Short mmCIF file of C-alpha atoms and ligand atoms in Angstrom, two decimals:
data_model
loop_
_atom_site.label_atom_id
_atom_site.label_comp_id
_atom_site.label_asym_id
_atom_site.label_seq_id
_atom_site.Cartn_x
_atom_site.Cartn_y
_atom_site.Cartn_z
CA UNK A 1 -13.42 5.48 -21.94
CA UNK A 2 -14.41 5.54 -18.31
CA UNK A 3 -15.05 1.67 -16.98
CA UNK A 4 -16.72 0.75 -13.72
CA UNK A 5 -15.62 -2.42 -12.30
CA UNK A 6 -18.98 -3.90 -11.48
CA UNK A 7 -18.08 -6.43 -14.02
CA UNK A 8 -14.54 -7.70 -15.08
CA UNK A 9 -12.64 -4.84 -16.87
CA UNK A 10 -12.52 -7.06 -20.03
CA UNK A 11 -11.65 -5.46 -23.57
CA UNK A 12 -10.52 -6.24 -27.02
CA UNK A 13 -7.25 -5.91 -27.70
CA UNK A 14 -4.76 -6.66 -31.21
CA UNK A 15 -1.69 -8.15 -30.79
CA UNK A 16 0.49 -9.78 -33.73
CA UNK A 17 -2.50 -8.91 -36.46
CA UNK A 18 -4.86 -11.19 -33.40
CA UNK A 19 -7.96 -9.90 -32.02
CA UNK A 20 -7.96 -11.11 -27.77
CA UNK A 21 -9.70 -10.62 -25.40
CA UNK A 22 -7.82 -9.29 -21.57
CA UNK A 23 -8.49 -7.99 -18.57
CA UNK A 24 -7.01 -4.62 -17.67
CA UNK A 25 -4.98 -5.38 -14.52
CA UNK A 26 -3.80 -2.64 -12.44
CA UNK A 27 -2.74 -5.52 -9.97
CA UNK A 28 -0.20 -6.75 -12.72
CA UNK A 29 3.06 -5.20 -12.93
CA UNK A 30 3.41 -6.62 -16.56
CA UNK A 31 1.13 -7.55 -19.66
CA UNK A 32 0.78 -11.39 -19.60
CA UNK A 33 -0.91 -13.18 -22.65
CA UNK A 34 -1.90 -16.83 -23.05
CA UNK A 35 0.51 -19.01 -25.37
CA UNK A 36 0.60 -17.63 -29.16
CA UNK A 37 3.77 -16.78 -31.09
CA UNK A 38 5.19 -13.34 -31.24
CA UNK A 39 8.19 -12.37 -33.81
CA UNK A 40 11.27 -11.74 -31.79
CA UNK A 41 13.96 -13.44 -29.71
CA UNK A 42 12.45 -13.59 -26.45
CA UNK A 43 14.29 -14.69 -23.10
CA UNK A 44 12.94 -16.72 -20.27
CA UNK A 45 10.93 -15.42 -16.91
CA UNK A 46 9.74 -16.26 -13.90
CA UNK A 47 6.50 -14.25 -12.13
CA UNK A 48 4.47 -14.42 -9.83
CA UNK A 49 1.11 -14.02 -8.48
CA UNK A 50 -1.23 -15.71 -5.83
CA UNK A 51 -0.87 -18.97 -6.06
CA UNK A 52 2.74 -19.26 -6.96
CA UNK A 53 5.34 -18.75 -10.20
CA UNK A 54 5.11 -19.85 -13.77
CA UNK A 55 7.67 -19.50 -16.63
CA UNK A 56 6.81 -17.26 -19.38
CA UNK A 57 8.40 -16.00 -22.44
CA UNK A 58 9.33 -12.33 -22.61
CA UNK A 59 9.15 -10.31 -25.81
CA UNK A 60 10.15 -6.58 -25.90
CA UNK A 61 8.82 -3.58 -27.94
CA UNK A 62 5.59 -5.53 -29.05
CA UNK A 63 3.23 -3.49 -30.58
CA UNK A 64 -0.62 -3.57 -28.50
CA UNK A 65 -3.83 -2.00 -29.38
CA UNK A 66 -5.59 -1.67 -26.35
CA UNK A 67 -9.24 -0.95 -27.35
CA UNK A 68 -7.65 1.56 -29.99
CA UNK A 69 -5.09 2.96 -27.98
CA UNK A 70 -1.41 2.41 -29.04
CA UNK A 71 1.00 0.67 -26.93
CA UNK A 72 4.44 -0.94 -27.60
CA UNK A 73 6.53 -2.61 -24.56
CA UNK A 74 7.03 -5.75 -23.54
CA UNK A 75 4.93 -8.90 -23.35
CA UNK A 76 5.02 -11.76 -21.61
CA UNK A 77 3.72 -15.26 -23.02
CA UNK A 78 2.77 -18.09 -21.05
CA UNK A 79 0.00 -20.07 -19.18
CA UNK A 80 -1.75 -17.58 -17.54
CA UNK A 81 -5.26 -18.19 -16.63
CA UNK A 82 -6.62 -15.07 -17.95
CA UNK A 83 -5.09 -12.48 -20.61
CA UNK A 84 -4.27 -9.63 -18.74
CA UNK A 85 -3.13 -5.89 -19.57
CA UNK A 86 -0.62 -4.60 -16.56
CA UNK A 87 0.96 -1.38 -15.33
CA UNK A 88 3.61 -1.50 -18.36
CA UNK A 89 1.37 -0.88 -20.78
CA UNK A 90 -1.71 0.84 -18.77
CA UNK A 91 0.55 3.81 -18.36
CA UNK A 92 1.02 4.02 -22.09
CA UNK A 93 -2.23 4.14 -22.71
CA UNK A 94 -2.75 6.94 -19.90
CA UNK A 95 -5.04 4.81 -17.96
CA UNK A 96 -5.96 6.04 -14.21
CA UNK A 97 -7.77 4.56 -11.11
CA UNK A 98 -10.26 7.08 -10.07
CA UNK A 99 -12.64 7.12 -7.08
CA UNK A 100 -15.99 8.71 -7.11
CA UNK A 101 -15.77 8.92 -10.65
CA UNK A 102 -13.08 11.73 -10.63
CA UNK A 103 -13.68 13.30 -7.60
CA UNK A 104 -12.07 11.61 -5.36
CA UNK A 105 -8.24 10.80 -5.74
CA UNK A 106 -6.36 9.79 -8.97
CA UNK A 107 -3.81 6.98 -8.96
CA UNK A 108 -1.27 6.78 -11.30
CA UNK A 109 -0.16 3.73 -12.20
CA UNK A 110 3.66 4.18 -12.80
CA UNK A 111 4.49 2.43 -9.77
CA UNK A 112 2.47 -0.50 -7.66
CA UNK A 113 -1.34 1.14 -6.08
CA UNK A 114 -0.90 0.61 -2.57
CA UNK A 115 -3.23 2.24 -0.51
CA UNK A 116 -3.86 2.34 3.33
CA UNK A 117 -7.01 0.54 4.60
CA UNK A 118 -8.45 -0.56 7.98
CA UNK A 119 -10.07 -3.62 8.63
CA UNK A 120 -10.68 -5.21 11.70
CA UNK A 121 -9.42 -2.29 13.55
CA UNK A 122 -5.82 -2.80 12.48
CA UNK A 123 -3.97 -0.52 9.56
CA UNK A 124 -2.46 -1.95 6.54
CA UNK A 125 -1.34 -1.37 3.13
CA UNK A 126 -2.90 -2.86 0.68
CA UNK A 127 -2.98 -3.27 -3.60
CA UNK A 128 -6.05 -1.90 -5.14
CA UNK A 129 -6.30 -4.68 -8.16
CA UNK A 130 -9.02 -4.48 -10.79
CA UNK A 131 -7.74 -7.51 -12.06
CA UNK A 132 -9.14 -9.32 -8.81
CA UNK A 133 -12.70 -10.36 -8.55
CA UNK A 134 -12.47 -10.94 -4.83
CA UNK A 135 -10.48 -9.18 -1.84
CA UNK A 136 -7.91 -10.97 -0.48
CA UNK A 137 -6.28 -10.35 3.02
CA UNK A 138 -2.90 -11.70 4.95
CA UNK A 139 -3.64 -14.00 7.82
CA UNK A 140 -5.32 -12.06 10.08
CA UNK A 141 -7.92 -12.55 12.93
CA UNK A 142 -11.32 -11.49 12.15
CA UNK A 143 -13.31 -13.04 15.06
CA UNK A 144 -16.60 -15.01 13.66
CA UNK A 145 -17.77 -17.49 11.35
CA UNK A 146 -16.31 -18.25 7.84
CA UNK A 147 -16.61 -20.75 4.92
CA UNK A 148 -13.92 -22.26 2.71
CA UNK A 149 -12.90 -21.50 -0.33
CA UNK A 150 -9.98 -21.43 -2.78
CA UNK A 151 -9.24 -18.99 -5.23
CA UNK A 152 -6.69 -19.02 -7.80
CA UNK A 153 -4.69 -16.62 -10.24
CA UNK A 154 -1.20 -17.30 -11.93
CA UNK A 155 0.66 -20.08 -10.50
CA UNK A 156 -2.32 -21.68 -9.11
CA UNK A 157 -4.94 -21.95 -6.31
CA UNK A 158 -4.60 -20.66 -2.23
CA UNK A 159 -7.20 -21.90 0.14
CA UNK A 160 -8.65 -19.14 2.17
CA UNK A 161 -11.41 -18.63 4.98
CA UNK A 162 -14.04 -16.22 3.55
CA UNK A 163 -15.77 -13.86 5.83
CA UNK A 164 -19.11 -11.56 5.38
CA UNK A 165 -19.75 -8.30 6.29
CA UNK A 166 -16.51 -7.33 7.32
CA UNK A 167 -16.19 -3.26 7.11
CA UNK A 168 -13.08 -2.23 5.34
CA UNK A 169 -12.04 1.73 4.54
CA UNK A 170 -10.12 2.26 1.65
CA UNK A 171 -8.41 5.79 1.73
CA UNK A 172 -11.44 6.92 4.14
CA UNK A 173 -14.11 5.82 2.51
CA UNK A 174 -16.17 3.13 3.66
CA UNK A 175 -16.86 -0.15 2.15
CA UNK A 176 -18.03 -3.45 3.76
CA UNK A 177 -18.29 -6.71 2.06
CA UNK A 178 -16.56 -10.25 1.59
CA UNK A 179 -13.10 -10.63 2.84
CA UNK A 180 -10.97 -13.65 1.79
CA UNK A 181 -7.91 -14.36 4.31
CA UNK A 182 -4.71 -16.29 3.47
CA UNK A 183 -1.39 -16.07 2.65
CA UNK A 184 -1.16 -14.26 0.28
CA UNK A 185 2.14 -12.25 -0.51
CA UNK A 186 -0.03 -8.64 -1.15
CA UNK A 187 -2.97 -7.26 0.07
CA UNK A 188 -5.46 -7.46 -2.27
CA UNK A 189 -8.64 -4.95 -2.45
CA UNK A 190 -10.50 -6.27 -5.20
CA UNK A 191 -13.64 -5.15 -7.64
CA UNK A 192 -16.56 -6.26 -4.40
CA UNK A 193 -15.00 -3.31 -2.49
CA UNK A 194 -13.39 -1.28 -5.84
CA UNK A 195 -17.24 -0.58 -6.63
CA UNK A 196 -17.99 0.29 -3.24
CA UNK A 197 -15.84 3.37 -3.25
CA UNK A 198 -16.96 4.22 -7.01
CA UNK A 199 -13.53 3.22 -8.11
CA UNK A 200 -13.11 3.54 -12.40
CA UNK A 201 -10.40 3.18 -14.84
CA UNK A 202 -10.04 5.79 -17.21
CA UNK A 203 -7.82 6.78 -20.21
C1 LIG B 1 -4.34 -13.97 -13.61
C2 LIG B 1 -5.68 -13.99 -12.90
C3 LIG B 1 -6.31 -12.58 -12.99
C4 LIG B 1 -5.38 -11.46 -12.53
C5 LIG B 1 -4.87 -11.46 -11.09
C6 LIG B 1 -4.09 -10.22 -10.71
N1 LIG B 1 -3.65 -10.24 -9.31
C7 LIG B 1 -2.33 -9.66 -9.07
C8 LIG B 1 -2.10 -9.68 -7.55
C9 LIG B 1 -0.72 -9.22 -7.04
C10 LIG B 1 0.10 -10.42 -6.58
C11 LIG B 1 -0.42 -11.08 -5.32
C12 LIG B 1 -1.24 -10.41 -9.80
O1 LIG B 1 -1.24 -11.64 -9.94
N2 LIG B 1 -0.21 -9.70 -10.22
C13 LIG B 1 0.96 -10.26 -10.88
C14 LIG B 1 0.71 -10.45 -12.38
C15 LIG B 1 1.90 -10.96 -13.15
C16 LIG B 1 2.88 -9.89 -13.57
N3 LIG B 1 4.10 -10.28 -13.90
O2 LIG B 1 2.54 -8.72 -13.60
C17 LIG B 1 2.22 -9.42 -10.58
O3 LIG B 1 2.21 -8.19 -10.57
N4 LIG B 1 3.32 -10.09 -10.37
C18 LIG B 1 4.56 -9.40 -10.16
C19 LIG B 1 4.79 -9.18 -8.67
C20 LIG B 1 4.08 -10.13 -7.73
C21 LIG B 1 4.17 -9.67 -6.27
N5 LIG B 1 5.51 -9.15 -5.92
C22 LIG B 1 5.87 -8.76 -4.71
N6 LIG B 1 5.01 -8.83 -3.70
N7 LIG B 1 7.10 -8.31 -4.50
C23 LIG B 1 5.69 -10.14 -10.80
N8 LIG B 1 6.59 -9.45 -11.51
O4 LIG B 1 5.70 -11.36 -10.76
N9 LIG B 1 -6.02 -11.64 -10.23
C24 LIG B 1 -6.01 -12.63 -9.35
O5 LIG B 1 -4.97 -13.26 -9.17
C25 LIG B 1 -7.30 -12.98 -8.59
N10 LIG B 1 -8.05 -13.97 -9.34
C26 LIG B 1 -9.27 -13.71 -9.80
O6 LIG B 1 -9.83 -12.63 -9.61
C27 LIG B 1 -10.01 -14.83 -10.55
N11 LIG B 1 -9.24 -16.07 -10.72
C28 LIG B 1 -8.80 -16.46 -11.91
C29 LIG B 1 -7.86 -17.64 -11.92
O7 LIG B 1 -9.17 -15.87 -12.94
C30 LIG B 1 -11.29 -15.09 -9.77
C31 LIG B 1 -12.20 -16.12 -10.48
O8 LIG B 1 -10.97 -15.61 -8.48
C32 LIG B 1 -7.03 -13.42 -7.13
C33 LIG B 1 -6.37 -12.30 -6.31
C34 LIG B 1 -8.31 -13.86 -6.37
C35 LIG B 1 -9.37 -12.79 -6.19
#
């Protein structure tokens, strides 16, 4: 299919003989599902995200539908706070970020999609993540008025100052919309800018 990301990138997927629900995460290095047993001899992990690490269970050479496409790598069980489908098995599945709806580049997902963008009038590098809702930005001045907020993912929550109508150009092209800043350990450009630059996800 080809999916826009005005909503979350949420599809069916079966795993063990189970019909769940997950979010296709091209932010996720791995495939993390929500507690449920899985038949093999899995070994303890630690990952990552946001707001800190949990401990998971890792199970290798799992089978995964992913809305009808076949996958089989590894899994990775635990509390998560949403089911989510990562690189590991989006590049089975031949899945691609697109902008402009295929005219613009293609981005592979075999390794991390880091991308150059300017905000505030400063360069960085940032990770284009359809598995965030919200764009998230290392502590950085932008000059003006902001609210609040926390936002969470995984290990937990972050607070973070949120700031309006802040331009931001993603591989040249233009968006400009809500910024969240905070420590966060990536970048983050998430689906209120994706859908700016006509971003999909296609296989
Ligand atoms: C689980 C919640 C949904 C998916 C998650 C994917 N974000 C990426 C961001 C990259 C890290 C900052 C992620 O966590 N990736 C992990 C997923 C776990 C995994 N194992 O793949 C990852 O790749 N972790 C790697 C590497 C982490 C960074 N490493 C590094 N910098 N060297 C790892 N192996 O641990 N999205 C989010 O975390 C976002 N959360 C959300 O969009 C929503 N929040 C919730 C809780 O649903 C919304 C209501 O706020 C954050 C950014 C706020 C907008």
């Amino acid at each position: 299919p080809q999916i826009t990301l005005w909503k979350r990138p949420l599809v069916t997927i079966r795993i063990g003989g189970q019909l769940k629900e997950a979010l296709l995460d091209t932010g996720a290095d791995d495939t993390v599902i929500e507690e449920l047993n899985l038949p093999g001899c899995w070994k303890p992990k630690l990952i990552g995200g946001i707001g800190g690490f949990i401990k998971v269970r890792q199970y290798d050479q799992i089978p995964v539908e992913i809305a009808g496409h076949k996958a089989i790598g590894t899994v990775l069980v635990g509390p998560t706070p949403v089911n989510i489908i990562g690189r590991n098995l989006l590049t089975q599945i031949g899945a691609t970020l697109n902008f402009c709806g295929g005219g613009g580049p293609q981005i592979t997902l075999w390794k991390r999609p880091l991308v150059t963008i300017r905000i505030g009038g400063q360069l960085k590098e940032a990770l284009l993540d359809t598995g965030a809702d919200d764009t998230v930005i290392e502590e950085l001045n932008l000059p003006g008025c902001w609210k609040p907020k926390l936002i969470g993912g995984x290990g937990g929550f972050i607070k973070v100052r949120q700031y309006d109508q802040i331009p931001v150009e993603i591989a040249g092209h233009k968006a400009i919309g809500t910024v969240l800043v905070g420590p966060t350990p990536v970048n983050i450009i998430g689906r209120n800018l994706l859908t700016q630059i006509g971003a999909t996800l296609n296989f």
